[PDB]
Amino acid sequence: MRECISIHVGQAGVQIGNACWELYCLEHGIQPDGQMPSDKTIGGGDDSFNTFFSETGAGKHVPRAVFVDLEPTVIDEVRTGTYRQLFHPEQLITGKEDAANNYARGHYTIGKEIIDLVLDRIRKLADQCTGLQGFLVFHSFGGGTGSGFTSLLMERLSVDYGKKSKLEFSIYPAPQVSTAVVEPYNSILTTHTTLEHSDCAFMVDNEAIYDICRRNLDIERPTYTNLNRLISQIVSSITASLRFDGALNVDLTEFQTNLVPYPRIHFPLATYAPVISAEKAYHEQLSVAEITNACFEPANQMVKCDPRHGKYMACCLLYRGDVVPKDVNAAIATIKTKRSIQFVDWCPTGFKVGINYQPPTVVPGGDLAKVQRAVCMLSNTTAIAEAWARLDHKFDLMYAKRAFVHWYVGEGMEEGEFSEAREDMAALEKDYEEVGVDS
Amino acid sequence: MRECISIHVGQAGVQIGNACWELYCLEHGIQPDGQMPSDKTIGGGDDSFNTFFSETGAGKHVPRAVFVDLEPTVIDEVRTGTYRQLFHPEQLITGKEDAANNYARGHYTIGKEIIDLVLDRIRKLADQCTGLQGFLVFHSFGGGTGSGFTSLLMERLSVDYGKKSKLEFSIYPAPQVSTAVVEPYNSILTTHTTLEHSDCAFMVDNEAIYDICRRNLDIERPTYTNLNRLISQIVSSITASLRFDGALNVDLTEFQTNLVPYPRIHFPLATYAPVISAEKAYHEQLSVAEITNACFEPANQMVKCDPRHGKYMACCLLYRGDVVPKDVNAAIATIKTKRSIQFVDWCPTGFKVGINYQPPTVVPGGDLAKVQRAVCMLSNTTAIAEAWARLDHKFDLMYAKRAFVHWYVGEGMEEGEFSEAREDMAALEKDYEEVGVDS
Amino acid sequence: MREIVHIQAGQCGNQIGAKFWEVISDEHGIDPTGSYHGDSDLQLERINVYYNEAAGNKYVPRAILVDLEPGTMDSVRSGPFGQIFRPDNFVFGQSGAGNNWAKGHYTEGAELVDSVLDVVRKESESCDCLQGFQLTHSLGGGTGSGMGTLLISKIREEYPDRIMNTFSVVPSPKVSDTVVEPYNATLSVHQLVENTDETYCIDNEALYDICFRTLKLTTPTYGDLNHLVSATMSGVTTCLRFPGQLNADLRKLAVNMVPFPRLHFFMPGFAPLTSRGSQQYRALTVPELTQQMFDAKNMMAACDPRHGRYLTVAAVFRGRMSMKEVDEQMLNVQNKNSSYFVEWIPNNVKTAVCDIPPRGLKMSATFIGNSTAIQELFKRISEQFTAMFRRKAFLHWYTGEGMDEMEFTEAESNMNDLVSEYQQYQ
Amino acid sequence: MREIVHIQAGQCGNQIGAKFWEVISDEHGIDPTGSYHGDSDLQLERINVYYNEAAGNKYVPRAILVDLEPGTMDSVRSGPFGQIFRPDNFVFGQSGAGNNWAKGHYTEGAELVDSVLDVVRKESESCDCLQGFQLTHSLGGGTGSGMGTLLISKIREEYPDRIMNTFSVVPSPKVSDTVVEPYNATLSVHQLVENTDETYCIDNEALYDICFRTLKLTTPTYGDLNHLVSATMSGVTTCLRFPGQLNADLRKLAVNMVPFPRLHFFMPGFAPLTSRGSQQYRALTVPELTQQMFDAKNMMAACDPRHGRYLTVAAVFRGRMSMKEVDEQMLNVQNKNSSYFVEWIPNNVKTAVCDIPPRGLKMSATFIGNSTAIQELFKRISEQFTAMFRRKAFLHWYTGEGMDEMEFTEAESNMNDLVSEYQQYQ
Amino acid sequence: VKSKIGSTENLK
Ligand SMILES: Nc1nc2c(ncn2[C@@H]2O[C@H](COP(=O)(O)OP(=O)(O)OP(=O)(O)O)[C@@H](O)[C@H]2O)c(=O)[nH]1
Ligand SMILES: Nc1nc2c(ncn2[C@@H]2O[C@H](COP(=O)(O)OP(=O)(O)OP(=O)(O)O)[C@@H](O)[C@H]2O)c(=O)[nH]1
Ligand SMILES: Nc1nc2c(ncn2[C@@H]2O[C@H](COP(=O)(O)OP(=O)(O)O)[C@@H](O)[C@H]2O)c(=O)[nH]1
Ligand SMILES: Nc1nc2c(ncn2[C@@H]2O[C@H](COP(=O)(O)OP(=O)(O)O)[C@@H](O)[C@H]2O)c(=O)[nH]1
Ligand SMILES: [Mg+2]
Ligand SMILES: [Mg+2]
Report the sign of the C-alpha dihedral through residues D395, D400, D404, D408, in that order: negative
Is B195 marked within a binding site? no
Q: Cα-atom radius of gyration of chain E, to the nearest Å?
A: 8
CATH topology for the B384-439 domain: Helix Hairpins (1.10.287)
Amino acid at A179: T
Of all ligands present, the nearest one to the C-alpha of B98 is 2
Sequence-distant (6+) residues with CB within 8 A of D409 are none
User: Closest Cα partner for D208 from D174, D232, D241, D183?
Assistant: D174
B259 C-beta closer than 6 A to ligand 2? no
- Per DSSP, what are the bridge partners of residue C90? C65
Distances (CA, A) of B182 to B100, B101, B102, B397, B408: 10, 7, 8, 11, 11
Q: What dihedral angle (degrees, nearest 10) is formed by the CA atoms of A272, A276, A281, A286?
A: -30
- Per DSSP, what are the bridge partners of residue B138? B8, B169
| Closest CA of chain A from C54, distance in Å | 28
Under DSSP, the state recorded for C338 is G
Q: Which of D208, D228, D259 is the last residue of a domain?
A: D259
D201 C-beta closer than 6 A to ligand 4? no
* CB-side neighbour CA atoms (13 Å) of C241: 23
Which of the residues of B are catalytic?
254
- Dist. CA C19–CA C17, nearest whole Å: 5
Quick check: bond before A274 cis, omega within 30? yes
User: Closest Cα partner for A116 from A64, A168, A164, A68?
Assistant: A68
User: Closest Cα partner for D302 from D233, D348, D371, D383?
Assistant: D371
Q: What dihedral angle (degrees, nearest 10) is formed by the CA atoms of D296, D300, D304, D306?
A: -40
- Dist. CA C408–CA C426, nearest whole Å: 27
- Dist. CA D411–CA B322, nearest whole Å: 40
Q: In what helix (H) or strand (E) does residue A313 lie, and over which residues does it extend?
A: strand A312-321
* CB-side neighbour CA atoms (13 Å) of D227: 13
Q: Which of D213, D233, D259 is the last residue of a domain?
A: D259
What is the position in ligand 1's atom list of the atom closest to the CA of A143? Answer: 13
Count of C-beta atoms within a 10 Å radius of residue D223: 10
Considering only CB atoms, C96 lies closest to which of A251, A326, A435, namely A251
Count of C-beta atoms within a 10 Å radius of residue C361: 12
Q: Yes or no: say if A63 and A86 are a contact pair by the CB < 8 Å rule.
A: yes
Q: In what helix (H) or strand (E) does residue A404 lie, and over which residues does it extend?
A: none
Residue A353's SS3 state is strand
Instruction: For chain A, count helices (H), then strands (E).
Output: 14, 12
Amino acid at D368: I
Pairing of strands A312-321, A200-205: unpaired
Same domain, yes or no, for D180 and D90?
yes
Quick check: bond before B325 cis, omega within 30? no
Cβ-defined contacts of B70-73 (< 8 Å, 24+): B70/B94, B70/B95, B70/B96, B70/B97, B70/B98, B70/B99, B70/B106, B70/B110, B70/B111, B70/B114, B70/B144, B70/B145, B70/B149, B71/B95, B71/B96, B71/B97, B71/B98, B72/B96, B73/B11
Q: Yes or no: say if C18 and C77 are a contact pair by the CB < 8 Å rule.
A: no
Structural domain total, chain C: 3
Quick check: bond before B120 cis, omega within 30? no
Same domain, yes or no, for C381 and C364?
no
Q: Yes or no: say if B276 and B215 are a contact pair by the CB < 8 Å rule.
A: no
Sequence-distant (6+) residues with CB within 8 A of C263 are C311, C370, C421, C422, C425
Are D221 and B247 in contact (CB < 8 Å)? yes
* CB-side neighbour CA atoms (13 Å) of B251: 29
Tell me where in chain B the CATH 1.10.287.600 domain(s) lie.
Answer: 384-439
Out of 3.40.50.10540, 3.40.50.2000, 3.40.50.300, 3.40.50.1440, which CATH number does the structure's domain A1-268 have?
A: 3.40.50.1440
Sequence-distant (6+) residues with CB within 8 A of B253 are B133, B134, B165, D96, D97, D98, D99, D100
CATH of the domain at C42: 3.40.50.1440
Distances (CA, A) of B371 to A311, B22, B284, B287, C413: 62, 19, 10, 10, 81
Amino acid at D178: T
Q: Yes or no: say if C202 and C169 are a contact pair by the CB < 8 Å rule.
A: yes
Helices B384-399, B183-194: crossing angle, 10 deg rounding: 120
Polymer length of chain B = 439
Tell me where in chain B the CATH 3.40.50.1440 domain(s) lie.
Answer: 1-268
Residue A179's SS3 state is coil
Q: Yes or no: say if C2 and C249 are a contact pair by the CB < 8 Å rule.
A: yes
Report the sign of the C-alpha dihedral through residues A355, A359, A360, A361, in that order: negative
Distances (CA, A) of B238 to A438, B18, B317, B318, B366: 53, 17, 10, 7, 20
Same domain, yes or no, for C153 and C270?
no
- Dist. CA B188–CA B419, nearest whole Å: 10
Within B203-287, residue ranges assigned H as helices are 206-215, 224-243, 252-259
Q: DSSP per residue over B308-319, as a string?
A: GGS-EEEEEEEE
Quick check: bond before D417 cis, omega within 30? no
| Closest CA of chain B from A38, distance in Å | 31
User: Closest Cα partner for B147 from B158, B160, B156, B137?
Assistant: B137
Helices B224-243, B10-28: crossing angle, 10 deg rounding: 50
- Dist. CA A251–CA A248, nearest whole Å: 10
User: Closest Cα partner for E7 from C286, D124, B435?
Assistant: B435
- Per DSSP, what are the bridge partners of residue B67? B8, B92
- Dist. CA D204–CA B82, nearest whole Å: 48
Count of C-beta atoms within a 10 Å radius of residue B312: 22
Q: What is the edge-to-edge ordering of all strands in the sheet holding A312-321?
A: A92-94, A65-69, A4-9, A134-140, A165-172, A200-205, A269-273, A373-381, A312-321, A351-355
Q: Yes or no: say if A302 and A379 are a contact pair by the CB < 8 Å rule.
A: no
User: Closest Cα partner for A164 from A202, A129, A191, A204?
Assistant: A129
**Which residues, chain by chain, have CB under 5 Å from ion ligand 6?**
B 11
Pairing of strands B65-69, B200-205: unpaired
Distances (CA, A) of A432 to A339, C384, D137, D226: 22, 22, 63, 71
Of A11, A96, A213, the one to substitute when testing ligand 1's pocket (max ligand atoms within 8 A of C-beta) is: A11
CATH of the domain at C279: 3.30.1330.20
Q: DSSP per residue over A35-101, as a string?
A: --TT----SSS--GGGGTEEEETTTEEEE-EEEEESSHHHHHHHHTSTTTTTS-TTTEEE-SS--TT
Sequence-distant (6+) residues with CB within 8 A of C87 are none
Q: Yes or no: say if C178 and A259 are a contact pair by the CB < 8 Å rule.
A: no
Sequence-distant (6+) residues with CB within 8 A of C104 are C68, C97, C98, C142, C143, C145, C146, C147, C150
Same domain, yes or no, for D52 and D169?
yes
Same domain, yes or no, for D205 and D333?
no
φ, ψ for residue B354, nearest 5 deg: -140, 130
> Which residue in chain D is spatially nearest to B318 when comparing CA positions?
D177
Tell me where in chain B the CATH 3.30.1330.20 domain(s) lie.
Answer: 269-383
Residue C72's SS3 state is helix
End-to-end CA distance of chain E: 25
User: Closest Cα partner for A97 from A129, A75, A72?
Assistant: A72
Report the sign of the C-alpha dihedral through residues A304, A306, A312, A317, in that order: positive
Residue A156's SS3 state is helix
- Dist. CA B169–CA B359, nearest whole Å: 22
- Dist. CA A145–CA A149, nearest whole Å: 5
Cβ-defined contacts of C218-222 (< 8 Å, 24+): C219/A324, C219/A326, C220/A324, C220/A326, C221/A247, C221/A324, C221/A325, C222/A247, C222/A248, C222/A325, C222/C15
Q: Yes or no: say if D133 and D3 are a contact pair by the CB < 8 Å rule.
A: no
Same domain, yes or no, for C248 and C339?
no
- Dist. CA D296–CA D312, nearest whole Å: 16
Same domain, yes or no, for C361 and C382?
no
- Dist. CA D363–CA D244, nearest whole Å: 13
- Dist. CA C419–CA A428, nearest whole Å: 40
Quick check: bond before C272 cis, omega within 30? yes
- Dist. CA D326–CA D323, nearest whole Å: 5
Q: Yes or no: say if D250 and D37 are a contact pair by the CB < 8 Å rule.
A: no
Of B7, B8, B11, B103, the one to substitute when testing ligand 2's pocket (max ligand atoms within 8 A of C-beta) is: B11
Count of C-beta atoms within a 10 Å radius of residue C111: 12
Is C199 marked within a binding site? no
Report the sign of the C-alpha dihedral through residues B13, B14, B19, B25, in that order: positive
Pairing of strands C58-61, B92-94: unpaired
Sequence-distant (6+) residues with CB within 8 A of A275 are A212, A216, A217, A230, A300, A368
φ, ψ for residue D117, nearest 5 deg: -70, -35
Same domain, yes or no, for D67 and D184?
yes
Residues with CB under 6 Å of ligand 1 are A 10-12, 15-16, 70, 98-101, 106, 140, 142-146, 171, 179, 206, 224, 227-228, 231
- Dist. CA A377–CA A291, nearest whole Å: 10
Q: With 0-12 CB in 10 A as exposed, 13-18 as middle and 19+ as buried, what is A389?
A: middle
HEC sequence for chain D: CCEEEEEEECHHHHHHHHHHHHHHHHHCCECCCCEECCCCHHHHHCHHHCEEEECCCEEEECEEEEECCHHHHHHHHHCCCCCCCCHHHEEECCCCCCCCHHHHHHHHHHHHHHHHHHHHHHHHHCCCCEEEEEEEEECCCCHHHHHHHHHHHHHHHHCCCCEEEEEEECCCCCCCCCCCHHHHHHHHHHHHHHHCCEEEEECHHHHHHHHHHHCCCCCCCHHHHHHHHHHHHHHHCHHHCCCCCECCCHHHHHHHHCCCCCCCEEEEEEECCCCCCHHHHCCCCHHHHHHHHCCHHHCCCCCCHHHCCEEEEEEEEECCCCHHHHHHHHHHHHHHCHHHECCCCCCCEEEEEECCCCCCCCCEEEEEEEEHHHHHHHHHHHHHHHHHHCCCCCCHHHHCCCCCHHHHHHHHHHHHHHHHHHHHCC
Q: Yes or no: say if B204 and B173 are a contact pair by the CB < 8 Å rule.
A: no
Pairing of strands B65-69, B60-63: unpaired
User: Closest Cα partner for B140 from B168, B118, B104?
Assistant: B168
**Ranges assigned E (strand) in C170-309:** 198-202, 265-271
User: Ligand 5 centroid to A71 CA: how many Å?
Assistant: 6
Q: Yes or no: say if D385 and D309 are a contact pair by the CB < 8 Å rule.
A: no
Sequence-distant (6+) residues with CB within 8 A of D425 are D260, D263, D311, D342, D372
Same domain, yes or no, for D378 and D271?
no
- Dist. CA C149–CA C164, nearest whole Å: 11
Q: In what helix (H) or strand (E) does residue C413 lie, and over which residues does it extend?
A: helix C405-424
State how far Cα C209 lies from the chain centre: 18
φ, ψ for residue A7, nearest 5 deg: -120, 125
Polymer length of chain D = 426
Under DSSP, the state recorded for C145 is I
Sequence-distant (6+) residues with CB within 8 A of B275 are B212, B216, B217, B230, B300, B368
User: Closest Cα partner for A405 from A185, A206, A252, A121?
Assistant: A185
| Closest CA of chain D from B351, distance in Å | 5
What is the position in ligand 4's atom list of the atom closest to the CA of D225? Answer: 1
Which position among A77, A155, A207, A254 bears the catalytic label? A254
Same domain, yes or no, for C212 and C185?
yes
Give the residue numbers spanning the domain of D297: 260-373
Same domain, yes or no, for D78 and D220?
yes
Q: Which CATH architecture has domain B269-383?
A: 2-Layer Sandwich (3.30)
User: Ligand 4 centroid to D138 CA: how many Å?
Assistant: 6
Q: DSSP per residue over C229-251, as a string?
A: HHHHHHHHTGGGTS--SB---HH
Amino acid at A370: K
Same domain, yes or no, for C419 and C321?
no
User: Closest Cα partner for A5 from A63, A58, A78?
Assistant: A63
Q: Which of C342, C358, C373 is the last residue of a domain?
A: C373
Q: DSSP per residue over B278-309, as a string?
A: SSGGGG----HHHHHHHTT-GGGBSSSS-GGG
